[PDB]
Each structure stands twice: as structure tokens, then as C-alpha cells.
Amino acid sequence: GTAVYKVAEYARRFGVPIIADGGIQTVGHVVKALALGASTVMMGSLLAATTEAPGEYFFSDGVRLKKYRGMGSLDAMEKVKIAQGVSGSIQDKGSIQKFVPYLIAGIQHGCQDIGARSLSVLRSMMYSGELKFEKRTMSAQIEGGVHGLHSYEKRLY
């Protein structure tokens, strides 16, 4: 968040747009990244393990999992070394053609909650002080999720 805000603030002085690259896990992360000044949001793992993603699904513990690894992992440098990445597995998400519209609708509903009819208007509100923010202690984030239940199922789309 800090990186995105600071680099976007410096780069908007020169009309350069930046790309919030990494750490995206929900649609809310996308809305926050776009609100802090990122013009585009690059997603690696939110898109991996879909039908359009390279590699073939495998199986483990009865869930369809593709492979997801970092370009700085060891298993990817093999194509003294210091791995700056990790190789792992992501459960199937479906297809891009049914997932990316979910993100688009989520981004739109978030931007409507905010009160911004456009992403350019969203960033205009952010830079002019009209868009307000709010920190969250760790308790506020625990409360901001799902709590107080015995068990539950979360369906996004």
C-alpha cells in the first residue's frame, strides 16, 4: 500500500501510470490499489489455476490444483543460487471468462460504494482530499472478516 501510494504520487507528476504488482488477493485489494493511485493492477495468483493458465491440473487431497511458482524460485531458475520465490499449488478457480467479470463487477460496486463514477474520478477524489481513509488495528481487521460463527461457507460469485 505504501509503495503504491508513494510511487504513484511521484509518477503522476510526470504523467506516468504505475501498476500495482503483487499482494492482490481479493477485489478489495484491487479497489484499494486503484484508489491509492495505481492505474492498473497486475494479478499473478488471483489468476493462476484457472483454465487459461499454463500447466495442467493435478490432484492432491481431492482438490484440483494447478502449479503456481515464483520466477525467482529454484524450480524456475532451473530452466550458488538464492531463491527469492517459492513454488506451490493453487486450487482451481474456474475460467478467466467467468472470473474476470466477477472482479469487474466487484470493482464497480466498490467504486459505487466509494462514490466515484470512474477510476479517474476515484483517483481525483483521492488526490484532492475528498476520498477519505481509515486505519484498522489488528482487532479491526479480525472484526472486519467473518467471526462469531460455528462454521460457514463463503461464496464470492
Count interface residues toward ligand IMP (CB under 6 A). Answer: 15
44 is in an annotated binding site: yes
Which of ligand NAD, ligand IMP, its own copies, none interacts with 106 (beta carbon under 5 to 8 A by kind)?
its own copies
Gapped junctions in the chain, after residues (C–N > 2.5 Å): 79
Q: What is the C-alpha to C-alpha distance for residues 154 and 26, in angstroms, rounded to an integer?
A: 13
Q: What is the C-alpha to C-alpha distance for residues 26 and 66, in angstroms, rounded to an integer?
A: 19
Query: Is 106 one of the binding residues for ligand IMP (CB under 6 A)?
Result: no
Query: Is 58 one of the binding residues for its own copies (CB under 8 A)?
Result: no
Give every CB contact of residue 1 below 8 A, 6+ residues apart in sequence. Answer: 32, 33, 36
Query: Is 87 one of the binding residues for ligand NAD (CB under 6 A)?
Result: no
- The pair phi, psi for residue 66, each rounded to 5°, is -85, -175
Considering only residues 48 to 87 of the shown chain, the ones binding ligand IMP according to CB under 6 A are 70-73, 84-85
Query: Do the bridges between strand 87-91 and strand 63-69 make them parallel or antiparallel, or are there none, so unpaired?
Result: antiparallel
For the chain, how far is it from start to end, CA to CA, in angstroms?
26
55 is in an annotated binding site: no
Query: Is 57 one of the binding residues for its own copies (CB under 8 A)?
Result: no
The three grid cell numbers given for residue 72, joined into one nine-digit string? 525467482
Nearest-approach distance from CB 112 to ligand NAD, in angstroms:
6
Interface contacts to ligand IMP, rule CB under 6 A: 21-24, 42-46, 70-73, 84-85
Q: Binding site: residue ranges? A: 21-23, 44-45, 68-72, 84, 143-145
Which residues lie near ligand NAD (CB under 6 A)? 71-72, 84-85, 109, 112
